[PDB]
Amino acid sequence: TFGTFQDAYLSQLRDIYHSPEFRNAPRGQASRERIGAGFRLLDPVQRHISVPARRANVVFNFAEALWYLSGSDRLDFIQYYAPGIAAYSADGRTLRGTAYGPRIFRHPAGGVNQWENVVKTLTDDPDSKRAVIQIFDPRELAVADNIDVACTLALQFLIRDGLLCGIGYMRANDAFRGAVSDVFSFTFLQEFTARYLGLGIGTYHHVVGSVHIYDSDARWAERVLDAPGFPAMPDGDNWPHVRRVLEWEERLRTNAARLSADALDALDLPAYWKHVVALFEAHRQVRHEDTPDRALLAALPEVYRQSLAVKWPGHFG
Amino acid sequence: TFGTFQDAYLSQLRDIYHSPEFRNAPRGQASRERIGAGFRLLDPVQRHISVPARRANVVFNFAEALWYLSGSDRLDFIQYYAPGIAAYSADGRTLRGTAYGPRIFRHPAGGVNQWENVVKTLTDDPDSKRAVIQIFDPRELAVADNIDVACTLALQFLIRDGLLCGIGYMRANDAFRGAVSDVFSFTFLQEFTARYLGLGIGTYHHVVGSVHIYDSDARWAERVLDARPGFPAMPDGDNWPHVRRVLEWEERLRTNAARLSADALDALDLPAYWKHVVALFEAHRQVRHEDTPDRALLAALPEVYRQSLAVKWPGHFG
Ligand SMILES: Nc1ccn([C@H]2C[C@H](O)[C@@H](COP(=O)(O)O)O2)c(=O)n1
Ligand SMILES: Nc1ccn([C@H]2C[C@H](O)[C@@H](COP(=O)(O)O)O2)c(=O)n1
C-alpha cells in the first residue's frame, strides 16, 4: 500500500530490477519479470511521476486519457504525442489492443457502451460488485502475428463508504514505461467517473499478471532508480468540458489555431480544463516550432510546469 | 504465499470474518467484505478442503470442473450435484455467468475456443504473456435484472522455467463457498493444461476484487474456523480421451442409465486417477437414486475422497 503512485512505481521498479523472478523473452523481447504483482494507492488523484530523470510527459498522459474518452481508435491523434506508438499499428491508421476507447464505450463484443452500464449499475445498486468494464477480447488471440493485443483485462469500480474505488486488472504491464501512463489513465477514469457520480475518491488497486522491465530500458531505468500536488478534477459531469477540450485538441494538433495566454484564460471552461488546453497549446509550440510562451507556462499548476520544463528544457526550462 | 489451498482458504476466511473492511449488501445480500485480496499457492494440486466441519463435497468439485471441460451450459448436469445452483437459472435449463464451460471453449464473443488458442499461443511462444482465457462478457451488464453475471474475469497461464503457472482474476468471490470450488476448478484446469503441454505445475495466483462472506454463512464459517492425506496427481499427457470417457459415464450414472459395482469400477479401461472419479459418480448415484451403498467402492478410493464422502453422506459412507 502506498500513498501516491510515485512511491508504488519506484518500489516496484526496484523490486523487478534487483530481484526479478524470471528473465525471459516473450515475442523475442528480453525482460526482467515478476509474476502476479500489484499495489494499492491511497490517493489516486496524485497519479504523476515527478522524478526528473524519468521525464514524465504530462501532455501525453492527458492526451492518452482523452483519446480513450473520445472512443477513438485512430492513430493520428495519439501518434502526435508519442510517435513510436505507430509501430503497433498494422494498417497505419488505427490501433487495436492499444486503443482502450472503443473497448470502453463500444466494445467489439456486442458494441456495448460499458461506461454507461457501469454508471447505471452503480446508481441502481451502490454496493454492486458487478461494475466492470471489460477491455480484452477473446478474438485477439485467434489470428497469429497480431502486433497489438490488449494487455488490460478489465477495470472495476466500487462505491465503498461514499467513495469510488477503482481496480485495474492487467495480464501484463511494462513497469518502466506503460505503467506510468496506464495508472494515470485508469485513475483519471476513476476520478472522472467519481465526479460524474457525485462521489469522493477511494483507493485504486493495480494487479498485473506479468510486470516487467525490458532489457532495452535498463539504462534509463537505472538512471531513474539512481535519482506539489496534482490538481483535482471539478465536481459533476465533465463530459461537456471534455467535448470542448477535444475540439481544441484537434485544432491545436493540426496547427489550425493557436491560443495566447489571454485567449486561454478566456476559454469557456473550468480552470482545470483550461490548463489541459494550455498543455496542448504548449505542445503545439513544440511540434509546429512556434515561440514558447512564458506567460502560458507561469499560469499552469506547478506539477505541469515541472513536467514541461524537464521534458522540453529548451522550450520551458 | 501458502503451500496448499486449505492454508490459504482458512487464513482468508479468518481475515474476512474477523477483520472485514466493509459490511454492505450488494443486490440486498448482507456481507462482510475485503477489497483487492488474493493469495499464491505453491502446490496447486493440493486443492482440497478436508476440515470435517466444512463438509467439502469432492464429488461436486470434480463435477463442476468436468462440467467446464464439457463446454456445457446445461443446468440438469450441475444442479444434480448442487441443487441450490438452480437459483441462478432464469430459464430452468441453462446457466449464464455461472457456466464457464462455454466461456472457455466457445465464448459468446465470436464462438472462440480460447483453450485451443492458449495452447497454440504457448506452443509458438513459450514465454508468452498473452495466454489468457477471457470469461466475463460485456453484454452481461446489459441484461436487465440479470440473476447470473460472470464473476470470473479471466484465467491466465504462463510457462516459467518449465512449469505452468496459473492466475485467476475475479471481480468478486464468495470466500466461504465459491472460493472452494473456484480454486479447485481453476487449479484443476491448470494441472490438466500442464499435463497436456508436458510440463510440471507452477504456482497458482488468485486475485479478487470483492472477497466476502454472506451473513447467512457466518454461522457455518465460524464452525469451520473453530475446528493430511494428499490429493492425487492427474496423469501425464493428453487427458482429453479420458475426460471424454469420464463424461460418458458421468451422464449415464447421473441419469441412472447405468450403474457399476466396485469390481466393475476397478476393471474400467481408464487410468486409476479417472477410475476413482467415475467411482465418485457411482457413489453419488447410489445416494441420489437410492441404491445400495457400495462399501467396497469406498474402500478403494484415495483417503481424501473417502473422508469427503464419509463426512458429506455419513448415513451411506460414514
Ligand atoms: N496500455 C499498454 C499497452 C502495452 N503495454 C506493454 C505490456 C505488454 O506486455 C506489452 C505488449 O506485449 P505483449 O502483447 O506480448 O504482452 O506492452 C503496457 O504496459 N500498457
Ligand atoms: N463460480 C462462482 C459464481 C458465483 N460466485 C459468487 C461471487 C459473486 O459475488 C456472487 C454473485 O453475485 P454478484 O453478481 O452480485 O457479484 O457469487 C463465486 O464466488 N464463484
From TrEMBL, chain B:
It comes from the Bacteria. DCMP binds at residues 27, 129-130, 171, 173-174, 182. CMP binds at residues 27, 129-130, 171, 173-174, 182, 212. GO terms for molecular function: thymidylate synthase activity. Residues 9-224 form the Thymidylate synthase/dCMP hydroxymethylase domain. One of its GO terms (biological process) is dTMP biosynthetic process. The keyword ATP-binding does not apply. GO terms for cellular component: cytosol. Coiled coil: none annotated. PANTHER family: THYMIDYLATE SYNTHASE (PTHR11548:SF9), THYMIDYLATE SYNTHASE 1 (PTHR11548). This is CMP 5-hydroxymethylase. It comes from Streptomyces rimofaciens. The gene is milA.
